[PDB]
Subunit: 47 residues, 3 copies
């Protein structure tokens, strides 16, 4: 349930979700830089 009068334009609700996209995006570049580390692992036997 949520109120229906406060929060005019999410002055902090839109930037609040932004921070969630800040840590989430970082986690994506994390599993990505690790995926490239596993690919080289296979290049050690596929080279």
């Amino acid at each position: 349930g949520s109120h229906m009068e406060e929060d005019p334009c999410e002055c902090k609700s839109i930037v609040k979700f932004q921070t969630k996209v800040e840590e989430l995006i970082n986690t994506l570049q994390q599993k990505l830089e690790a995926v490239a580390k596993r690919i080289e692992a296979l290049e050690n036997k596929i080279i």
Copy 2:
């Protein structure tokens, strides 16, 4: 072409683009969790 008077501070245009970053980011973590599934596929023959 876009109007030049309405939309004061994108009260919904900035949060509207945010939702696009919500599904787009999810798709990134999707091709990422699948990339790790393909890496293990190679680990089955590189192990």
Copy 3:
């Protein structure tokens, strides 16, 4: 150090950071579409 009166609700500071998430997210899907290209490279010897 930052002022403590200007910038009411980041009318352009929240959307300004959004653009940073626009190019960053693209870079994530970039290393991702390249990671899948390296995975197939291993599938050429693991197939």
